[PDB]
């Protein structure tokens, strides 16, 4: 997250921190994710497509720092790694950038809801917030595009939703951004998601309910003028989410 504020997991309790174990035992941060039901974390396929072995992944819930075992946190392995069958990557745009991770503790259990571990509501079909609505994003991604390290403390920011017609403008993304994608950014281009924030939530308060409207997917650079963050439009994928979580 470029700009924004440092926060803690009690403010983002649906946030999942996803890591990968390498041969030799080293563990590194991969991407963010969101808890949609006790057994299911939703994220982005581009985070896993090059290493599609479910055994390689570690998922944390209730974790506030990158290298701290936060009080109340829960650690899980991935029982099922479900990647969207028609995923593809263009120079910038990712297509069907959505993945499901069925999680399980070493005891074979799903998440135990608490003050720091909570699910996030899914949207209803054809019901997204209007353009201009403020939504929040969270993650452990880069604070600056030139950084190679990620921040130790979890960060959040607030961005505004941008219409499909505005995002398809020539100085924005043209026809590279589709109707299955949602754009959001800072009108002053000072705050945004960045590399490392992929798979994490775009949460919008809609008709009084906090909703998982988007999943961090792609963007040209980070907090670059006329280059919004692009998010998987969760409402389009409700039949795919319901069928793959059954």
Measured distance CA(53)–CA(81) in Å, rounded = 8
Residue 197 CB, nearest distance to ligand 4UP (Å)? 6
Least Å distance between CB 192 and ligand 4UP?
A: 5
Residues 6+ apart with CB under 8 A from 177: 93, 164, 167, 168, 183, 230
Alpha-carbon distance of 145 to 126, in angstroms, equals: 34
Nearer to ligand 4UP (CB atom), residue 90 or residue 107: 90
DSSP code string of 184-232 = EE-TTS--B--TT-TT-EEEEEETTEEEEEEEEEE-SSSSBTTB-EEEE
> Which residues, 109 to 138, sit near ligand 4UP by CB under 6 A?
none
Residue 175 and residue 168 in contact, taking contact as beta carbons nearer than 8 Å? yes
Contact 186, 192 (CB under 8 A): yes
For position 44 contacting ligand 4UP by CB under 6 A, the verdict is: no
Q: Which stretch binds ligand 4UP (CB under 6 A): 35-43, 119-127, 175-183, 211-219?
A: 211-219
Segment near ligand 4UP (CB under 6 A); pick from 10-18, 53-61, 113-121, 188-196: 188-196
Per DSSP, the chain holds a count of helices (H) and strands (E) of 2, 15
**212 is an interface residue for ligand 4UP by CB under 6 A:** no
Least Å distance, CB 110 to ligand 4UP, is 28
Task: Point out the catalytic residue in the list 97, 128, 186, 192.
Answer: 97
Structure tokens at 79: 């029982």
Closer residue to ligand 4UP, CB minimum distance, 39 or 223: 223
Nearest to 234 by CA among 191, 187, 199: 199
Kindly indicate which of the ranges 58-66, 173-181, 217-225, 238-246 contains the residues binding ligand 4UP, using the contact rule CB under 6 A: 217-225
- From residue 134 to residue 163, the character string flagging contacts with ligand 4UP as x (rule: CB under 6 A) and all else as - is ------------------------------
Q: Which residues bind ligand 4UP (CB under 6 A)?
A: 46, 192-195, 197-198, 216, 218-219, 222, 229
Residues with a catalytic annotation lie at 46, 97, 198
């Amino acid at each position: 997250i470029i700009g924004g504020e440092f926060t803690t997991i009690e403010n983002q309790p649906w946030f999942a921190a996803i890591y990968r174990r390498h041969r030799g035992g080293s563990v590194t941060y991969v991407c963010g994710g969101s808890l949609i039901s006790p057994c299911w974390v939703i994220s982005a396929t581009h985070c896993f497509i090059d290493y599609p072995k479910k055994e390689d992944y570690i998922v944390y819930l209730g974790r506030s720092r990158l290298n701290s075992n936060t009080q109340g946190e829960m650690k899980f392995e991935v029982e099922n790694l479900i990647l969207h069958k028609d995923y593809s990557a263009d120079t910038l745009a990712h297509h069907n950038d959505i993945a499901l991770l069925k999680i399980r503790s070493k005891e074979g259990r799903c998440a135990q809801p608490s003050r720091t571990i909570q699910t996030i509501a899914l949207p209803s079909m054809y019901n997204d917030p209007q353009f201009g609505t403020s939504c929040e994003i969270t993650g452990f991604g880069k604070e600056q595009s030139t950084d190679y390290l990620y921040p130790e403390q979890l960060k959040m920011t607030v961005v505004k939703l941008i219409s499909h017609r505005e995002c398809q403008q020539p100085h924005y993304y043209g026809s590279e951004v589709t109707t299955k994608m949602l754009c959001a950014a800072d009108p002053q281009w000072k705050t945004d998601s960045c590399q490392g924030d992929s798979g994490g939530p775009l949460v919008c308060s809609l008709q009084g309910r906090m909703t998982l409207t988007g999943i961090v997917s792609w963007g040209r650079g980070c907090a670059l003028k006329d280059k919004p963050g692009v998010y998987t439009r969760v409402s389009h994928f409700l039949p795919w989410i319901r069928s793959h979580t059954k």
